[model samples]
Target: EFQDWPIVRIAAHLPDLIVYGHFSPERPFMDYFDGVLMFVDISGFTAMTEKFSSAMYMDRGAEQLVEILNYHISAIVEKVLIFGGDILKFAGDALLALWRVERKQLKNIITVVIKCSLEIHGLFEIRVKIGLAAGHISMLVFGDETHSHFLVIGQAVDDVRLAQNMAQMNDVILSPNCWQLCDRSMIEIESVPDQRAVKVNFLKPPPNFNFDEFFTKCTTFMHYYPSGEHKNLLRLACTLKPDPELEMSLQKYVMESILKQIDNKQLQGYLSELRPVTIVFVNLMFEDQDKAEEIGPAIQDAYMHITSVLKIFQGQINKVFMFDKGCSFLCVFGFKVPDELTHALECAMDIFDFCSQVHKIQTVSIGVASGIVFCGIVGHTVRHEYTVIGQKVNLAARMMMYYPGIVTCDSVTYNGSNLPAYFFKELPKKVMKGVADSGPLYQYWGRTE
Candidate 1:
């Protein structure tokens, strides 16, 4: 008897305040009903057309943007609806969609939304910010006796809105509850530093802004930190850059360079300070499926042969992470290591020898840098994962790239100064992409050649 109403009637009565409920099976149904909400907002609309005829500019821009966004929104709507969701409304530059899905599907919904938003951005002038939330919600069919609409009432909606407000362009922010439903590896939510927060309504052009000049200055800054000083300078460029593409590219370049040095073992002088413990990082780039097939067996064989190996270094190995598909492995050794440089090299050689004997592939490149890094699990919810952060980490990676076998030593780990001695071969002054100043780079030459 309650299954007689049309979708139009249901949607029309959705916002009504009344009684009597006719639930329609024809409307939509999900296996397990958990409330999930997603909010998306466009960025830079106000700034792009500030000097034009505000109304006409907004109207034209809105039309073009919406036309492009509609295709994406429609795709999202179709997927969500197929999975038991309702596209509640689309306001000027924002959309509110809801889903009544299983807890498992909530994350799926968020992931799809983020991917679709990015794809949509490629077609439109506007960038998107996405926020997602999940929780139990109260739903009912309520209206007059002749008409009723399915309505959702819950905090999940509020949570998603809050997340949206917190999100920056091209960013996906999720409520803690929402993050719990997602795969930790695919989506990472970090607690935004309080200092990163800016007033929502603070609208003003950046001072002394010239895009070309700004990037030039930032590149100069990067070159000055080749030995790893002036990290704050990079952070400053990120803060001032309004262009999302430029900022992300800058971060990627800086991070990759630093990571390469740490992987190559070229930073020994820095390691000596954190001496006494062994830090082994195996930079494995698996080329054959046979190696993958052999790795488990090899580890098992080693484990069976060395009982003392685990016990002896039980507390010494501070952190261990195996990257996806065994492409890389990061290992950190704890303890106030004296003679840290020697221990690091020894450990590197050990891993190098072991892999060389068992596998026929390209040689591994390793880098080691030792210093005080703020190491901890960083993320939101119970899904916090570990990371080591400091200039030492970046410098080690950069040095590794220059020296394939082993590259190591960063100023942060030892003298804490950007001087010539830290590098094996002094590089000409070149502007490293994101840094504020030009600095020298050091290269190492191994005897194997």
Candidate 2:
């Protein structure tokens, strides 16, 4: 009866119903169903070869695979829905689905299985092995500010996978209990020789099966440079092949590119300041259990507090930055002051106070470093990027663990430049990791005003 609701009304009132939000603003509800579970995985995937010889296949293969899976899976879903079944989720190549009592006329789950299998077999050249089981699953929506997805995780999904593993080539394997749920008279099943459950790791398909030719044709460049220069190198790499095909090949490297972009932007901003920049790096150790949304506001509040202080001395403050989850930010301070050391330290304290007070975000440590860094754009004819490269940038991040709340500059930042007398406090000489030599370090406590 619910299926009779108009699509427009559903989209207007409950956008969650659209698959992938393509038709509406609603979140899809496939993972929420509670009933029989069915799963399908493509077989012999590693041996398949790609159709094209360009970089596009290499870059876009994974996405393409997902797309292809969704296309065929949707067809099977239509059949399932027609027969009173609901698809819970398409977990990568594997699909989780359920059937309710309205489909009781179907007698057994095999009717659904056979229908699904026949449809998939007709759609692709690659063999797909399927598995089925019926059991309880803990269904829920899991995610935060950065990302979120519907998840139905339980032994049912696992059992289905196990059944798939036990299946022979081009075979449909069902657990004994699963087999009993189907009408024995209409369906044919071979009693797998050893009923003992076999273990199966969710192995990625063999590249040879579908995209082997594409990967073999990709020209890889192996050039080594310092870590600081990686972004530049990546930009060069992208420039080497400036076609739509190249964009396809860069899929594996996009995360690296985006991160480098974020890093490059922050570093350049810090270096552009006229005076030696006073940098503050906040390392907030969030509770692993907390979601991104729960902590997003707290992060923003901490950023605001730092900005408020920077406004006092007409200091040119760069953006308050944080990586999606696993990274931190560097705030570049500007304007020469009488007591630079005191200024940096005071600013650090302000950051700590705000994080701990107004927002109640504790367990945070801030690392401060200020010095000359080579900052500019670098790339080939087709592409270029503005970036920053130098030891100061690296050291600032490296020193995050030296002290809690605030770790002021070691010698690299202090002795590198001449500033107001107010900016001097010698720290102990210590062996720092990744640096070639141990050096004297210093810290100062100064506020912006």
Candidate 3:
């Protein structure tokens, strides 16, 4: 560990969470930490997107709507940071935060996170559910390194989600493990057997517990050492604006829409809205983990090979991590909404052919569907990234998973595609996630051209 770890240099593209986690550029992105996690996910956002769909297509109208969302999300995040919590992952309208604590601080720290959770729900404006849990956490950064992506894995991560599922509208839910370790008398809480968690209410931190002291600890998180003779440099390090030169690297992974917003100078803020676009699900996997390891390199290499092809079709890559039993990449076409489905159709086939040829040992399943999705930046300040979240995104994924080594698509993609080079075979409707009564599905067989 070196004391003079160039904080400014790394903080430019890496999330603030990673820097505070003391990530060193010379090393692989791997970290082990222990903390309490609070996951705040906003439900009912889909309803708003539906209501404001046309207004959002109005652009500035969507900017106003995004402002309201920012008001809600920003307030909650600042509240946590003010009280010594580090935001781990901030998803679309959701915040998953952590309060790293010493062994001595564990029992009492939950009170702070619990109290913080209450403040988040107290807003009563947005429909928010918060999940709380504690334990060891693992973060493994995957992907080819500026496009370095990360996966936060642990029982605690999964536990927090379940707790979040049961949070409901009125209360913050805590995992059983979290409840067992917490200072019970300091907060109003009850057991929920049906939910398999505990519901927390009425936050009341002990009088002796100091808030300012803990916040300073969080502020010092950027510090390489607990304390140094002159804290001025670290203080200045925290205060100065991020250098412009290094920040440009983040644009390499920017969503096309976000890139536009940045170009227009729409207040240096992130845009959040629903955009109707073609979703292409590309799945590459090996049934065996060993074969996966052997063949995985081919898949990684194949992703590189498809880059120019996807770009030519105006496709934007969203995710390229392991999903279900294989490595998957979900790409979007028609981000501008002006492009035709043929671009996506043609692109999918190209991707399908490219991957199938790149690696012979793995199954290549490609799914294509088109519909609206919440396409924008998700995650907190300095840690955000683009994401597409909605039922239709899932629809493309389900079809991709239905079978293997074949190109499949839904009714939307099936009907919209106008490419003469390809034809389809209508498949019988079968049950799949979020689309049991799906329509006009087809198997996208070899192209005639």
TM-score of 2: 0.37
Candidate 3 lDDT over 1-449, as tens digits, reads 23322234234223444543434443234576777888887875545654555653565545554556656666776677555566655444466777776655666678777877777777775678888998776666533444544445566776886896676676688888888788887767878877667887676667886766754554454323224544433222243245454444444344545555555646444445566888888887765443322443565566665676787887877765453346677888765645557788778888887787764436788888888777665433433456666666767888888867788888887777775424887777778744646677888865662
Which of 1 and 2 is the better model by lDDT? 2
Residue-pair clashes per prediction, in order, are 47, 33, 1
* Residue-wise C-alpha lDDT for candidate 1, range 305-415, written one tens digit per residue: 222232343322222222222323344555334445444444544555555455433445555555544332222111112234333444444444444554443323223
Cα displacement (angstroms), candidate 1, residue 323, comes to 5.5
CA RMSD of each candidate after superposition: 25.0, 18.8, 6.2
- Residue-level lDDT tens digits of model 2 in 236-265: 221222243322322211122233333354
Off by over 4 Å in 2: 1-278, 314-327, 334-342, 358-360, 378-385, 412-430, 445-449
* Clash pairs, model 3 backbone: 90-379
Cα error of candidate 2 at position 408, Å: 1.5
RMSD of 2: 18.8
Score residue 43 of candidate 1 by CA lDDT.
Answer: 49
